[PDB]
Amino acid sequence: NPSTTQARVVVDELIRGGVRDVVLCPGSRNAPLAFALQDADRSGRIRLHVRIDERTAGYLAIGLAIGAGAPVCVAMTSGTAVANLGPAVVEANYARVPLIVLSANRPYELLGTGANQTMEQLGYFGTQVRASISLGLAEDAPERTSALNATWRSATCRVLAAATGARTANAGPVHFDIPLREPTPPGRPAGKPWTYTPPVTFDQPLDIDLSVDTVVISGHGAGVHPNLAALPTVAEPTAPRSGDNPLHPLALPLLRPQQVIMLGRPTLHRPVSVLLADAEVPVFALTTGPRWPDVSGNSQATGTRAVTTGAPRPAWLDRCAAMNRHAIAAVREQLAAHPLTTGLHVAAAVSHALRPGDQLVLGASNPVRDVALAGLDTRGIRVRSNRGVAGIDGTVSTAIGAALAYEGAHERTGSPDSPPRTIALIGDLTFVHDSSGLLIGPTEPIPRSLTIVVSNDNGGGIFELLEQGDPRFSDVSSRIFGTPHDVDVGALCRAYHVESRQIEVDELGPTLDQPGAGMRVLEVKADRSSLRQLHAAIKAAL
Amino acid sequence: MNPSTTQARVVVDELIRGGVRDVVLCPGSRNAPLAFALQDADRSGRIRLHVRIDERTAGYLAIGLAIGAGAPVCVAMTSGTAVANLGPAVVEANYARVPLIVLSANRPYELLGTGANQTMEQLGYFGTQVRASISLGLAEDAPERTSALNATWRSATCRVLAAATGARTANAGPVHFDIPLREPLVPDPEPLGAVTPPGRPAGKPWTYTPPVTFDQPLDIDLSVDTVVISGHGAGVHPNLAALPTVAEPTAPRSGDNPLHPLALPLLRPQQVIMLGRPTLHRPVSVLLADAEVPVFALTTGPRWPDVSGNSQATGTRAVTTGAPRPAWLDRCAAMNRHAIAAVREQLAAHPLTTGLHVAAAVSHALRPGDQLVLGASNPVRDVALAGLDTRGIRVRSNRGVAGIDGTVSTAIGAALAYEGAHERTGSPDSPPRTIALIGDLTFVHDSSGLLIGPTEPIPRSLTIVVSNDNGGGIFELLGDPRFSDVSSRIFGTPHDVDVGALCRAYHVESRQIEVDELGPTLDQPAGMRVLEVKADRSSLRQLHAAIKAAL
Amino acid sequence: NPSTTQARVVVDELIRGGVRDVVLCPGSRNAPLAFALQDADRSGRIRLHVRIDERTAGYLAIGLAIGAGAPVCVAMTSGTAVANLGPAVVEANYARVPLIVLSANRPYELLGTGANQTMEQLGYFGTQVRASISLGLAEDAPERTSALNATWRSATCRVLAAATGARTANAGPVHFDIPLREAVTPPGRPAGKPWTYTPPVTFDQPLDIDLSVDTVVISGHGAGVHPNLAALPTVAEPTAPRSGDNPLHPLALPLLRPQQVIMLGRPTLHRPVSVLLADAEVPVFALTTGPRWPDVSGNSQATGTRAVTTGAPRPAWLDRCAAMNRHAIAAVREQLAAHPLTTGLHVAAAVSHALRPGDQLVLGASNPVRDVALAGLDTRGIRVRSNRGVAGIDGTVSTAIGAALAYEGAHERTGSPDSPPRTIALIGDLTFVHDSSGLLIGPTEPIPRSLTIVVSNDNGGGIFELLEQGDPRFSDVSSRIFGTPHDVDVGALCRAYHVESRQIEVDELGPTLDQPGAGMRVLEVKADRSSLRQLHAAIKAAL
Ligand SMILES: Cc1ncc(C[n+]2c([C-](O)CCC(=O)O)sc(CCOP(=O)(O)OP(=O)(O)O)c2C)c(N)n1
Ligand SMILES: Cc1ncc(C[n+]2c([C-](O)CCC(=O)O)sc(CCOP(=O)(O)OP(=O)(O)O)c2C)c(N)n1
Ligand SMILES: [Mg+2]
Ligand SMILES: [Mg+2]
Ligand SMILES: [Mg+2]
Numbered sequence A: 001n002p003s004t005t006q007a008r009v010v011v012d013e014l015i016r017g018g019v020r021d022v023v024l025c026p027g028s029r030n031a032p033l034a035f036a037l038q039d040a041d042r043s044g045r046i047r048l049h050v051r052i053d054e055r056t057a058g059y060l061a062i063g064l065a066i067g068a069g070a071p072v073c074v075a076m077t078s079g080t081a082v083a084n085l086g087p088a089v090v091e092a093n094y095a096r097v098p099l100i101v102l103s104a105n106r107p108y109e110l111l112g113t114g115a116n117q118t119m120e121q122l123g124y125f126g127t128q129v130r131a132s133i134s135l136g137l138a139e140d141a142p143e144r145t146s147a148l149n150a151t152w153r154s155a156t157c158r159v160l161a162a163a164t165g166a167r168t169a170n171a172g173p174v175h176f177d178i179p180l181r182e183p184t185p186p187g188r189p190a191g192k193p194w195t196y197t198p199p200v201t202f203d204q205p206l207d208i209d210l211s212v213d214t215v216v217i218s219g220h221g222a223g224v225h226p227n228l229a230a231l232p233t234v235a236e237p238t239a240p241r242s243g244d245n246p247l248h249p250l251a252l253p254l255l256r257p258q259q260v261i262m263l264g265r266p267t268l269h270r271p272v273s274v275l276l277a278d279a280e281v282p283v284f285a286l287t288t289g290p291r292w293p294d295v296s297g298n299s300q301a302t303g304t305r306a307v308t309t310g311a312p313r314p315a316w317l318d319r320c321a322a323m324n325r326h327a328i329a330a331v332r333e334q335l336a337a338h339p340l341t342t343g344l345h346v347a348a349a350v351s352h353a354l355r356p357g358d359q360l361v362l363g364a365s366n367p368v369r370d371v372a373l374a375g376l377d378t379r380g381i382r383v384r385s386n387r388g389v390a391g392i393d394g395t396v397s398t399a400i401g402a403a404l405a406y407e408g409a410h411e412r413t414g415s416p417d418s419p420p421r422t423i424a425l426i427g428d429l430t431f432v433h434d435s436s437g438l439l440i441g442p443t444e445p446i447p448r449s450l451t452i453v454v455s456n457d458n459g460g461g462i463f464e465l466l467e468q469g470d471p472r473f474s475d476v477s478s479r480i481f482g483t484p485h486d487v488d489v490g491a492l493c494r495a496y497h498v499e500s501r502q503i504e505v506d507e508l509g510p511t512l513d514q515p516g517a518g519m520r521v522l523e524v525k526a527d528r529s530s531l532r533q534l535h536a537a538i539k540a541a542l
Numbered sequence B: 001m002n003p004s005t006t007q008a009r010v011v012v013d014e015l016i017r018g019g020v021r022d023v024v025l026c027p028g029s030r031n032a033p034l035a036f037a038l039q040d041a042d043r044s045g046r047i048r049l050h051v052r053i054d055e056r057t058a059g060y061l062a063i064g065l066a067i068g069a070g071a072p073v074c075v076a077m078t079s080g081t082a083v084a085n086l087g088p089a090v091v092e093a094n095y096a097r098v099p100l101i102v103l104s105a106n107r108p109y110e111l112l113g114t115g116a117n118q119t120m121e122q123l124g125y126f127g128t129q130v131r132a133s134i135s136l137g138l139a140e141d142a143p144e145r146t147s148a149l150n151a152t153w154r155s156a157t158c159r160v161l162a163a164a165t166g167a168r169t170a171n172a173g174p175v176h177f178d179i180p181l182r183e184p185l186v187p188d189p190e191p192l193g194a195v196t197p198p199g200r201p202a203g204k205p206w207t208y209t210p211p212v213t214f215d216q217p218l219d220i221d222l223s224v225d226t227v228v229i230s231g232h233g234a235g236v237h238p239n240l241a242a243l244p245t246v247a248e249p250t251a252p253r254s255g256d257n258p259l260h261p262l263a264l265p266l267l268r269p270q271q272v273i274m275l276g277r278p279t280l281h282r283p284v285s286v287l288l289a290d291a292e293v294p295v296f297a298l299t300t301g302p303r304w305p306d307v308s309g310n311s312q313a314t315g316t317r318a319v320t321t322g323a324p325r326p327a328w329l330d331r332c333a334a335m336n337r338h339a340i341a342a343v344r345e346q347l348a349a350h351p352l353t354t355g356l357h358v359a360a361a362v363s364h365a366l367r368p369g370d371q372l373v374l375g376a377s378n379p380v381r382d383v384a385l386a387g388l389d390t391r392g393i394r395v396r397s398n399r400g401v402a403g404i405d406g407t408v409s410t411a412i413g414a415a416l417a418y419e420g421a422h423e424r425t426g427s428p429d430s431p432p433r434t435i436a437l438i439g440d441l442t443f444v445h446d447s448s449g450l451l452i453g454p455t456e457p458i459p460r461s462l463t464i465v466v467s468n469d470n471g472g473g474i475f476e477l478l479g480d481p482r483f484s485d486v487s488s489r490i491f492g493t494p495h496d497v498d499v500g501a502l503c504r505a506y507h508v509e510s511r512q513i514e515v516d517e518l519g520p521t522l523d524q525p526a527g528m529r530v531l532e533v534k535a536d537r538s539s540l541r542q543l544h545a546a547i548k549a550a551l
Numbered sequence C: 001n002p003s004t005t006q007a008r009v010v011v012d013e014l015i016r017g018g019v020r021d022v023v024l025c026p027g028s029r030n031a032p033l034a035f036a037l038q039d040a041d042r043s044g045r046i047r048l049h050v051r052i053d054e055r056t057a058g059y060l061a062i063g064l065a066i067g068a069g070a071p072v073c074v075a076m077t078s079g080t081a082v083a084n085l086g087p088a089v090v091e092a093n094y095a096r097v098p099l100i101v102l103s104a105n106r107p108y109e110l111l112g113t114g115a116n117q118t119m120e121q122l123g124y125f126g127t128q129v130r131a132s133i134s135l136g137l138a139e140d141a142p143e144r145t146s147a148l149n150a151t152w153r154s155a156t157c158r159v160l161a162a163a164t165g166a167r168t169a170n171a172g173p174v175h176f177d178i179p180l181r182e183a184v185t186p187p188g189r190p191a192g193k194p195w196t197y198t199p200p201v202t203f204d205q206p207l208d209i210d211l212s213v214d215t216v217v218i219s220g221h222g223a224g225v226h227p228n229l230a231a232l233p234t235v236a237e238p239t240a241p242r243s244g245d246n247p248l249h250p251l252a253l254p255l256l257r258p259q260q261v262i263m264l265g266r267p268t269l270h271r272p273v274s275v276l277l278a279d280a281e282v283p284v285f286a287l288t289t290g291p292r293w294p295d296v297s298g299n300s301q302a303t304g305t306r307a308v309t310t311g312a313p314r315p316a317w318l319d320r321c322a323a324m325n326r327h328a329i330a331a332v333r334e335q336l337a338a339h340p341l342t343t344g345l346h347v348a349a350a351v352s353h354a355l356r357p358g359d360q361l362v363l364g365a366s367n368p369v370r371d372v373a374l375a376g377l378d379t380r381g382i383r384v385r386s387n388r389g390v391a392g393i394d395g396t397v398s399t400a401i402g403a404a405l406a407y408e409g410a411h412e413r414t415g416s417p418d419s420p421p422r423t424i425a426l427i428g429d430l431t432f433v434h435d436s437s438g439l440l441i442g443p444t445e446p447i448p449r450s451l452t453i454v455v456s457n458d459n460g461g462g463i464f465e466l467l468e469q470g471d472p473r474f475s476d477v478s479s480r481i482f483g484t485p486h487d488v489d490v491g492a493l494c495r496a497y498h499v500e501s502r503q504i505e506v507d508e509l510g511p512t513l514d515q516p517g518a519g520m521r522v523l524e525v526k527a528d529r530s531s532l533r534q535l536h537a538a539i540k541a542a543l
Helices: A003-017 A034-042 A053-067 A081-095 A142-164 A251-253 A270-276 A314-336 A343-353 A366-373 A395-412 A428-435 A460-464 A471-482 A489-493 A506-511 A530-542 B003-017 B033-044 B056-071 B087-095 B143-166 B282-289 B326-351 B355-365 B378-385 B407-425 B438-445 B481-483 B485-490 B500-503 B515-523 B540-550 C002-016 C034-042 C054-066 C081-096 C142-164 C271-277 C315-339 C342-355 C365-376 C396-413 C428-433 C462-465 C472-483 C488-496 C506-514 C532-541
Strands: A019-023 A048-052 A072-075 A099-102 A133-135 A175-178 A205-209 A214-218 A234-236 A257-263 A283-286 A302-305 A306-311 A359-362 A382-385 A420-426 A450-456 A498-503 A517-527 B022-025 B048-051 B075-076 B102-105 B132-135 B177-179 B213-215 B217-221 B226-230 B246-247 B271-275 B295-298 B311-315 B317-321 B371-374 B392-395 B436-440 B461-468 B509-513 B527-534 C019-023 C047-050 C072-075 C099-103 C131-134 C174-177 C202-204 C206-210 C215-217 C233-237 C262-263 C286-287 C302-304 C306-310 C360-363 C381-385 C423-428 C451-457 C500-503 C520-526
Touching: A003 A034, A003 A142, A019 A034, A019 A053, A019 A395, A034 A251, A034 B355, A034 B485, A048 A053, A048 A395, A048 A428, A048 B485, A053 A072, A053 A099, A053 A395, A072 B087, A072 C202, A081 A099, A081 B087, A099 A142, A133 A142, A133 B075, A133 B177, A142 A175, A205 B102, A205 C360, A214 A270, A234 B461, A251 A314, A251 A366, A257 B132, A283 A306, A283 C019, A302 A395, A306 C342, A314 A343, A314 A489, A314 A530, A314 C365, A343 A366, A343 A420, A343 A450, A343 A506, A343 A530, A343 C081, A359 A395, A359 B282, A366 A420, A366 A460, A366 B033, A366 C451, A382 A395, A395 A428, A395 A450, A420 A428, A428 A450, A460 A530, A460 B048, A471 B033, A471 B048, A489 A498, A498 B226, A506 A517, A517 C306, B003 B143, B003 B177, B022 B033, B022 B407, B033 B048, B033 B075, B033 B102, B048 B213, B048 B407, B056 B087, B056 B102, B056 B392, B056 C315, B087 B102, B102 B143, B177 B527, B217 B311, B295 B317, B326 B540, B355 B378, B355 B461, B355 B515, B355 B540, B371 B407, B371 C262, B371 C302, B378 B436, B392 B407, B392 C488, B407 B436, B407 B438, B407 B461, B436 B438, B436 C462, B438 B461, B481 B485, B500 B527, B515 B527, C002 C034, C002 C142, C019 C396, C034 C047, C047 C054, C047 C396, C047 C520, C054 C072, C054 C081, C054 C099, C054 C396, C081 C099, C081 C360, C131 C142, C142 C174, C206 C262, C206 C286, C206 C302, C206 C488, C215 C271, C262 C271, C286 C306, C315 C342, C315 C520, C315 C532, C342 C365, C342 C423, C342 C451, C342 C532, C360 C365, C360 C396, C365 C423, C365 C462, C381 C396, C396 C451, C423 C428, C428 C451, C462 C472, C462 C532, C488 C500, C488 C520, C506 C520
Parallel strands: A019 A048, A019 A072, A072 A099, A099 A175, A133 A175, A205 A306, A214 A234, A214 A257, A257 A283, A283 A302, A359 A382, A359 A420, A420 A450, A450 A517, A498 A517, B022 B048, B022 B075, B075 B102, B102 B177, B132 B177, B217 B317, B226 B246, B226 B271, B271 B295, B295 B311, B371 B392, B371 B436, B436 B461, B461 B527, B509 B527, C019 C047, C019 C072, C072 C099, C099 C174, C131 C174, C206 C306, C215 C233, C215 C262, C262 C286, C286 C302, C360 C381, C360 C423, C423 C451, C451 C520, C500 C520
Antiparallel strands: B213 C202
16 A cells, blocks of 8 residues: 555654654544554654643643654644644744644545544644645555655655754744555665755854943743853743853842843743833844844844953942842742742742752743742753743643653663653642643553652732732732632542652652652642732842 | 723623623733623622633633523633633534634734744634634723724624624624733722723613524425434424434424434435434434435524535425325334334343443433533433433533533533523522533543632532443444554553542542432432442443344 | 546536636646536536636636626636735625635645645635635545535535525635546436525514614615615615615715614715714614624614614605705716816716616726716616725726626526627726736637726826825825826727727717627726816815
8 A cells, every 4th residue: 555655654754853752642533654653663663652632742742842852743633633732833833842743634535514523723723833744645656666755755854854943943843744545665774864954054143242231131942152151141941051150030120231132032020021121221132043032122133143342341240240149148038037838939949959960841830930039050950841832731741741752862872870850840720731641541651750849829829929919909819810729639649640749848859859650749838828928028138 | 991901891891781691711911901800790790700720621611601501601811822722612612603702812913923922823823613703903092082992892892792693694603802902901000980981871782783583494395204313403393393303412302203313224214304413323324425315404504514415405494295104103103112122121131330321320310401411422322322302401512523622611611501591580499400421531531620719600500420431432332443543552451540539639529329329319419519430341342232133 | 537527527516506607717737627617618508718817817707706696616727826816806705706716736746845836825715715615536436426426516516505605695705626636427406406405595684773763874885675765865885776766965975964874785985974884973773694794983783684664754854865965966067067177077977877777887996986976876777896895996807897798698598689788897097007908808718799998097096186195285295106197008008909999088978888889898088187186175165
């Protein structure tokens, strides 16, 4: 059958392209490439992950992709797949995650006369994906086997290149259709991809004078810039650090920088937003890819690297370092003097328990910010967070997939050491949102060293710190923003046969130092009724 | 009053004037103007607010609130993936023709593509699944044209409601209503006591559009041997009431001459009248796939199903000439009695409680006035197999796409709307019962739909029966492709998820009982509860073979 | 050959669905259904129209549909076809024209890796079409011939149903794909009947309206006929069918104080109409068919499909309106007589005077369609066409040509032994230059027998003289960027395409229209726009 030959050629090319994991869901029909994928899974060339929940499957693919940087395929055939995959595909587009969405249209059947069990289509594919490629239906022609093998492998390498950003430096989701009718020609020698894409550079140098009082702000997707390593740097948790001179986010409003270098895409902290929008401050955007971040439109120039003249005034560096120490002190002490555990205490504890080579996975809301408020030093750490569109959905499967991909890479190094830990920190709403991600059949890969820390303040803590958190809304905000739920986390973990423990904040460190089952949830109860006061006390101690 | 608060209050007001009684809300900062406005309407009793955490299952809750009493229902959420999480419920609402209003907050459209946090292409995200995609203009600070802005906001809100209820189209469905909103997003400390721009006098909708009467008479001769097949969304046809009728559980009965689905392949209809959209029964599909028998499609709206290649004509109602042969009605009535007798006998002779036994017991417990919610895979198949008489009861099921998402939330939402509709009657009697029958995989999958926050409305009389055979009604009853497909390997091992632990996790009363206690337990109440009945799946294929042999 | 069987089944069902005309263009590959359509053309079962310009070809299809109300197919395979069809597809959506766009995708070929010279997609199909249906590849299964013939014919009826609004009362464009791999044909129903028959449908939404309140009727594009409203003063657009005989000149409207408005169809003309419809003190009742209702300001009180009336207009009100109508008809005619130069308004008044029952009238956007209304044309017994969906000045020549062909075809189908009725088109000069391509028709292709295109040529855009940018403080700037003079030799253009042409004066227009010429002719009448604004100022002052 030409369709089975074609499917094996594609799967083979996908494996040479660096795909190591494929996610699937049961549906109305067989998945695309199902048998060739099954053969490769059995042979150990790739690893399959199956889930019933199509939404959590999309996010499992994201995690499997950002854990070690590899392209990941997700393949489902059902009438709800496109709708359920939407959230993950949007995150993959905005965070530039190489996600390949496989489909298998049927050209011998009617479309548009009723509900389609294979693909029920929304409007986001047009706007979200880097490419939409459909292989031909496989012709029955042994005469043309060599020419078809070339066409198929060329097209597969185009899918892979579009998703990884190999030539565009703009990785993201790709829609790859392999049609079939209802009801192996080799690749390049020595395992090379059919169409090889050697390394590319996009170079856009900007002239910047460092003698001007400069602060670096690095956000999601920031590059590494050695020539900027000495400047005071307010770094989001997921930004790689270029140097060793951190500036705490809370210190920023008490300095007066005269220019800003912005790396990647900042999304955290109102003081950062305000500074980038200040008309009297030059802002230089250094980022990869086609677009640049600039909500205010205030930025002066954008490129990919800086060509620097001068150096920072010693008085400026020394003044930034003293506000940095005052902010660190203000947090440590007001946390010490607070009589109730909050998410900020939980984040502080997780940050101390971390060691080099760990992978940290951060939920949206307070956790990703609290870790920054606690001054976590991210050097030697891989920090992952779905900052593309900052959803609270799918964070459990993202952590699981990230642990799996990260352990898989460490395994392949052959090293005798135990698999490096993955530690997730997420809020209680975030955990309830994607609890279904906890359900993993015995037939499926399970992380060996994943700890999910759930900081549970029985609602949405971040909203205590916004305008709706003002006391004049006290009666009203509790229901429509606090959103309390009274979930028994321990029961939920028991229901899914997931090792679970409820501990106090000071036991968090010790518990995380002691290894446990491959996958486990550590719940720490927290309070959010006092959170706006705690943050007010930290500000006043600045 | 700042522009965001003013706009939000005008929109919420016009939605209430348009007949919206329930609103599902999920938390966020960008939708804060909507959340404040809705909670004010809740506090003064103009609507009933339901807050949820998970946008996805929250959309099926809204679906339940819409199908329970027949009213348009809004779900409101923040910008970004929160909106994308409504996709699954939008698809169901489209195919099941449910008046679901997705009311999303957005950033100003000019911020698209600037790197703004939690922003995405929202307008048109759903494509052709929605009846309409409507946007409001960003609210300007310009009091001189407050009354002009009031008119455009209420008109837009009236277009949303008309598209969703099908007031002009006769084709209800979901509508995307996107509202770009900018700071300030919370109500100002001052002015105190501002006045929201007024709607029409006497609470009338700003632009009033009455429900269309859509009519398409079609001639049909009843003397030709006729079977009626009615599926999801079918209408009632008194002049067809005497015909033998294979009716899906969700189809309203027009008459009293039932024909069991198993009997149909053993009869020889010479023509078919197809009511609504029948998807459920394999015997039905086989018959409709046969291009030789003439089929007439009677539907309540402009859509008609593609299940038959030989639909001769479409209509909304038949104009009947003649009457059926008494011998033909005799023949069908005899096969009906035979078909159900085979089922009840083989059921009684089977030594193990299967999901079919649970469905038979549930069907036997119901009385007129009950609402019954069925998970759209096997529970709806089994209840029909057991021969449930649906006269005088409301059967709800997500038969649009018959997916697995949101079945629990839909049961909860149907119960709340149905009880509410009966609070308004004024009867002082206890609220009607809502009984849901859900399989264990479906219940586990949407278990988080059980979650109702302490401050949120709880059904007064919903019982969720879980027929737990520890794995699907899947590889029993087959589906040659499925044994080959590697994704089926998750179905080879019983999942063993503890149902009682799940009900504990969402603080819902749950008991585990035997099928014989089911009838008495349901007559007995107590708010919301789950009854888990364990069940065998191993003998299930043996049971169906015995029924097939008995025919 | 399976696709040959499929293609013939589809063409046969399309024919049974009332398709009489199909528009094609040469392209990189063969049009969908090309050989089945040829066979039907040869046999006189359908009529093929070929054009090289894909854009004019779409507007020709629009004309072939609106000329007698039939569904029309357009079939092009080229790398530019979707882009060139866009304008007509948008017009088909907004004017609710039953336009079927045929395509033929190749499922054995790669998509998305490079330029696609079979169909290069834009973003508009997802927002403009009523349906997008793909037949699916034809396979080699002779036993399933009955089942496949049923499936194909069903899908084709579903396509036709979506395009004509047979069940939705919402006609519009549909995308119909028949994919391709690269003499007995299975029969449809007895007696030429469609495979899935759709009996007549009604959408009924009655509204209670009190006629004793001082009421005016404004009817626009797509207005329906309402007997119970025939006596009210009615400001009608040229394309709106008249219900009665109490016209109310649009220039009269600002001089009356109506206390409620019944609005029929979709109004697009006259700023006094827009002002009245937006007046918060005036209840507005929108009566229209289809899913949506017009309401720019949001001021409307209710919408439906018909009126249930109580009461009757006060006789004082009727005479006040009938007299204000007389005042305005007279102010226009007297200041037209008093005006020194020929303007487009003069040309319109002359064309109005020359029309008679049985004629089809095609109006360009811009001043022509307004001027006919200001000239007080009586449209009873006259079929008035204009592309008011989006009011483009593009494609009006091919629209008039297609309208004429379809209207003539309807008359020839009767046995009448008469010269076919006249189609008279009135368009401005920019509009004519925009779609001049539509004049080029090969000897092989159908040509209207009685089409006369009148071109009111004021060497630019007359309508902008009458707008705010036409005020004298912009005299230097506006000439170039709104007037856009071109100095085209209209007679030389028509001679290049072998089209009978005459430059004539306005009094000469009635006589020339009375005796026929070649089947297609262009009558150019030179007009002035320099004095246009003051002419309208004179008519305002006279009121
Ligand atoms: C699917 C979805 N639906 C809604 C939202 C809006 N939202 C957030 C956003 O405000 C967070 C934005 C950011 O930059 O992190 S943060 C949030 C509350 C999360 O509560 P939590 O998980 O208990 O964390 P907590 O520590 O209590 O802040 C909600 C509900 C969302 N982000 N995703
Ligand atoms: C393709 C296209 N491109 C531009 C426009 C804008 N436009 C118009 C519009 O303003 C008229 C709209 C209406 O309601 O009639 S009217 C117009 C001038 C038409 O000049 P004309 O054909 O010589 O007519 P004239 O009698 O001189 O007014 C132009 C350029 C358009 N309508 N279509
Ligand atoms: Mg929380
Ligand atoms: Mg089960
Ligand atoms: Mg002109």
